[PDB]
Design a protein around this ligand. Sequence first.
Ligand SMILES: [Ca+2]
Ligand SMILES: [Cl-]
Ligand SMILES: [Cl-]
Lengths: 289, 289, 289
Amino acid sequence: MADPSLNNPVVIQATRLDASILPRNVFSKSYLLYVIAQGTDVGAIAGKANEAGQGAYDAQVKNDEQDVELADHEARIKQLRIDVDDHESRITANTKAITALNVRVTTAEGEIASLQTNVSALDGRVTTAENNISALQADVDDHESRITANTKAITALNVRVTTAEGEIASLQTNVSALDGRVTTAENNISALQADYVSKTATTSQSLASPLNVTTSYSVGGKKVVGARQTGWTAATGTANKGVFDADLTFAVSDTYTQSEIQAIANALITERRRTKALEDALRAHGLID
Amino acid sequence: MADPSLNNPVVIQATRLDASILPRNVFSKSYLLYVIAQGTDVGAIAGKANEAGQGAYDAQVKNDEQDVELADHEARIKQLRIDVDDHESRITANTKAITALNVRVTTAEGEIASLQTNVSALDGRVTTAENNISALQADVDDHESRITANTKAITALNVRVTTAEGEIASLQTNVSALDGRVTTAENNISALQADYVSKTATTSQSLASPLNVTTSYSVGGKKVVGARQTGWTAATGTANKGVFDADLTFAVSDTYTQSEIQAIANALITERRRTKALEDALRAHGLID
Amino acid sequence: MADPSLNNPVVIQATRLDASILPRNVFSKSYLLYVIAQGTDVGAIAGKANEAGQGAYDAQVKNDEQDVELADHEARIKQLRIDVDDHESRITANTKAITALNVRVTTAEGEIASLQTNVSALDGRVTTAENNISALQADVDDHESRITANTKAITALNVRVTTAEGEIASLQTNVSALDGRVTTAENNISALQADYVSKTATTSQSLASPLNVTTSYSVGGKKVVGARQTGWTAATGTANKGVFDADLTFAVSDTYTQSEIQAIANALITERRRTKALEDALRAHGLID
Ligand SMILES: [Ca+2]
Ligand SMILES: [Cl-]
Ligand SMILES: [Cl-]
């Protein structure tokens, strides 16, 4: 460290030299040009050897407050170094984060503006949709208000069709019924014209049957027959269908002749028998009783 | 500071002594040698306090030169930990903000990847919907092509059904007009068959009325009756409808007999009354005038 | 740079003034003490100046070791600011770049938050349109059934009206054809009305024809005119339809002087002439053959 002894003065120098008292008798002048000078030189060398060690201590005691402030330095540096070195790994790490973050920010911002245009695209896409759906519900509303009016007038014309369809058969069975009714009538009229007598024809009409009339038969507007006459007694006798002559019963004379009255009586007999068979006619027919 | 006074030596008067200066007689040999060896030492001891004070000065120059290059290191060491304190407050405020940026950023694409899976799912939910819309029109768009096909038939049918009901209204009016005639026409033909005289029936027919005829009355194909004859004059007298003699005979005598001639005139009378009666009955019927 | 020349001392004489060597009566005690003490001081100044320069040399060699650690003191601190100056360049890069990344992130987080409030309303715009679509899908499924039902209605409505339209027309002929045949009939009917001969007629009838019947004409219920009579022989003679009387024209007296027999003879032959006329009349009419 330091030496304090250095700072301890040796100065003595007990005595200062004078002559007297020294053998100035036994000495040459020159030993006295030495012995007084030797004493002064010895004493000046001491004080100088003393000052040499005062300054040697001051230089030693400075070196000891230098080494103490060297050692305070040596420490303040090492903790300044251990600090920059740790600050180093810490900044090197702080940037390493900033650089691998900005990449997380860039991958974000890039998807967002993509997401931004992948959003308002879907909004546009649903607006087309929305506007369609509403029109589709505008048409379906019109379609429902129509189909039903179609169904309603289909029912309304079906009840007019099934009516006529059943009235058609009514007429069609009225026509075929009247068809049989017409043909038998026209056939009965054809026969009725064949078997009937007309007030209008000359062509002689032949009955297969007897005839009856109320009062008189007639021709030309004159009465030709009447009721069978009454009151008759039937003439009996012999009916003469033989020859009949109108001759004079003659020879009537002035004298009685038997042969003529015999003729007149025989021209009576035979005249009565015509009138008898002329009566046999009017009876057989029935014109008289 | 330091002392420049130490480079200053002290000069000495004492110097090497020849035997001439010394008192050979007075001093012992050993004290003779001591005094000559004195000046050596006395002079050589000087050569140190000289050389010590030099190196004491030379050590105070190298000292004071170090002292300013110490405190130079100190202004540097005090300025260094000063800027290093400006190091440590910054990096730890840099690393506290580094983890605030990692948390924010993680929340960034946490929401992005949600934004990304919704937009993708809504695209899938849109691509399904507009698919359904595309056909939804295709259905509806054809529907009104059918509705206008249906509704048109409806009007086309309602016009064809109407004209059919107008016709049938006319038909049914005239099937009841006809069926009201043929029935009457079957009524008048029914009264005709009861009221007519016929050619076919064998049994006797009859009239409630007087009958007239033209030019003839016939039976069996032969004409039995005909027109009335007008040339007649009325036969007068009394008519005899009573008993008429059957084969009345007369027996005549050769000589005149009154009673025999009386009977012949009487049978002339009666038979003249018989011929008057046939004609009187004939004029009653009207066969003659 | 140390001078070891200050680490070596003086060698001084071993003998110091034993006084065995000192001048006997020559020196006064005044000078006897000085000389003796001057031997003790001189030898003392040496062994100090020896260590007064031993200190300086030790205040030098230490300063040498002081200059070697200062060399390491500067060579460190130079590096200390060499890596520190790089720090505040690399920290101010760390700190200013921290601020550039935030302002991108702050913006980025708020344009997402607007992106999520837009897409949360999309999800419900898609879903509402999702709900109005299948409501249309089912309504259209209901619309398809109803239309097919509607068009199977009119197709079968069409098959009925045509089958009906042709049914009316054939019916439209057969009614006016029936109208004809009835008019033909009912016209021939009224002919039979004004012409045919009645059984029940009251007023006297007429015929433009000769009548002929098969067996018996009758009037009143009894046979009057039947088939003509045969077996007759045509009477030869003349006829008299003139004046006639049934009167008694023949007188008989009791004698024959005169012919009044010719009066009975003339009345028999005017009577046979009526009986001829009465026979003719029945022959002309046809009643007799
Ligand atoms: Ca120093
Ligand atoms: Cl429809
Ligand atoms: Cl940093």
